[PDB]
Design a protein around this ligand. Sequence first.
Ligand SMILES: [Co+2]
Ligand SMILES: [Co+2]
Ligand SMILES: [Co+2]
Ligand SMILES: [Co+2]
Lengths: 356, 356
Amino acid sequence: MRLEKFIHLLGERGFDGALISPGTNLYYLTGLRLHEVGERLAILAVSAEGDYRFLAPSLYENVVNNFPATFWHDGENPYAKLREILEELGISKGRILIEDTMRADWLIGIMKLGKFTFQPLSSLIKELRMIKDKEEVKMMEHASRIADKVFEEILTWDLIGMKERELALKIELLIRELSDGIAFEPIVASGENAANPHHEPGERKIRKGDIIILDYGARWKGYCSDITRTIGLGELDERLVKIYEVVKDAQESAFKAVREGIKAKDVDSRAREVISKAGYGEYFIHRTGHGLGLDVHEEPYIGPDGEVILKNGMTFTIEPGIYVPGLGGVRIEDDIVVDEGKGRRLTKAERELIIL
Amino acid sequence: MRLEKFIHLLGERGFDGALISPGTNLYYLTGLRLHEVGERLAILAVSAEGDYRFLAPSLYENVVNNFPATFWHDGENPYAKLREILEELGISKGRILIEDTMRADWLIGIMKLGKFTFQPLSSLIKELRMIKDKEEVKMMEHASRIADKVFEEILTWDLIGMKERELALKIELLIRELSDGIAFEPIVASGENAANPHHEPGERKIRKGDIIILDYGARWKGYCSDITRTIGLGELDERLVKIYEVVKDAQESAFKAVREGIKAKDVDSRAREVISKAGYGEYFIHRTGHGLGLDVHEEPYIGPDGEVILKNGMTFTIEPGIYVPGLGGVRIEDDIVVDEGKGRRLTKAERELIIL
Ligand SMILES: [Co+2]
Ligand SMILES: [Co+2]
Ligand SMILES: [Co+2]
Ligand SMILES: [Co+2]
């Protein structure tokens, strides 16, 4: 049904076709999934008329099921074969949508097969992927359920002495155990390192007294979860305990505001104001949230620049944070789904400050 | 030195400039490494005139040290700022090289900043990276020794009943313990799965009478190792025991032929002929090898179509293999450097058939 909706939407927006290399969008529209495609040209070509063909390396004739295809064997010019395909479908010229993540070398090669006008596929597909259907929500529900479970397990561990990279690897192995895989490289940021929202787990040793930001996500049948919890080891510096309660308040506040009809930026503003009123406005160095589904980061964005009007089915995160250089940081993130016109938490893990 | 040789090459070869997104090429040239850049425009613009600038999101500010950079903040149009940069370096039009792995959406945006003709960066940079300098060989040397340590370690584990996926995981973890990380996902193909060169480790349990292909690699300061060894658990089918002797002699032959001044395909022909004369010509479905360095796969390619004239400093693999359906397969792979006009094994793990 999706591929057909996409096709109708293609015409409604004036595009003649689309070229979609493997990845989340391809999967979304067809269920097709190729293992490590790398350099080998693999492309779903779609016409606004209704026809479509998937060009792929002979090596994938098994995974493609019976999806209309045309294979190319090594020694052949994938680009020439694509050109023929573009002709049969009648799109060897015109405005063509291009998968956002496709390799530049493939696009360069595609540029020689005809005279086209290009635009990123996301500019149009986001309209469909932003509103999750019932099954997609169920899948995200389980991914979030697993993220909750992983958190519970982490708390039974003895963190002291562990190095960030080490804790992150344990989290990662657990996620790979409980799910289809990590949604992204887990992030463990301890002590003063928690002050960097984009910290990359390293050699720092976790010690008593350290605040720790735990950020990770699982994947279930392709759908992602993305959670973040901040815990403390022993007694935390008093300045960080105060900060925590503030972020907690901001996150719950932003969540309650979630309603069908409000702009994404208003949700961000609702968490933003709580943090400003407490005097930490300058330390909240990022958007309040981002959407998720087949990817960790997708529409709609929950920042001061989010223009999307929330609607039932949309899924995104709420994770305001406060980062103080030389001291640390705190972030509390939940995956939220707009349901029955109201915000509903997909992740249930403990929100109160936990001191191991 | 590298960047200046690249700039010199840009001019000699006819190009006006290059735009390089994060990845191995950006690293080779500048030592710059950006963790999970995702969708944030990060580009190194380089003019043939010697001028260069690095546009990166403000979050990588400290990681880029003293490199000439212009940073942008979430909420701005980094494409607008790239335009200004192309303006001052004098490359808002002309023949530009594009990082092969750059996202299509970035390229598409770049396309709106001027009239260009593009060509993949690798077509030119491959001329530099193919010739490894002393330190690069040193790094790969450590990477290869770590691949050998891993082999020795594998021989002490009890493999009976262990699933392929499980052994692959252990190899992965040991490699991550001993080095900077895996070069690619370890491969374990047991029994008849050893017949498929592209086999992906599954749930099949390793049992006696099984031959097992072990294919994995390590990373050391960015440089890769890629080794392959085939072992046997208990007593194997006599056919396989001889198929192994052919591969061994074949592998050693191609290694002996490695000399400065010979065409790549000739090293391949050498291993290839030893196998044909033994009668298994049709069960050797791939190139004898490929070059490696910052990436697992790079120039020169050691196959029937290999046109490169081997010179000192080149690093590639010699890994011929025999794959017979319903029976199994065997591959022995070493990483080789052309040193003093002769071939030299970087990987030295035991090549004789070992039975556990
Ligand atoms: Co997170
Ligand atoms: Co997140
Ligand atoms: Co290999
Ligand atoms: Co290998």
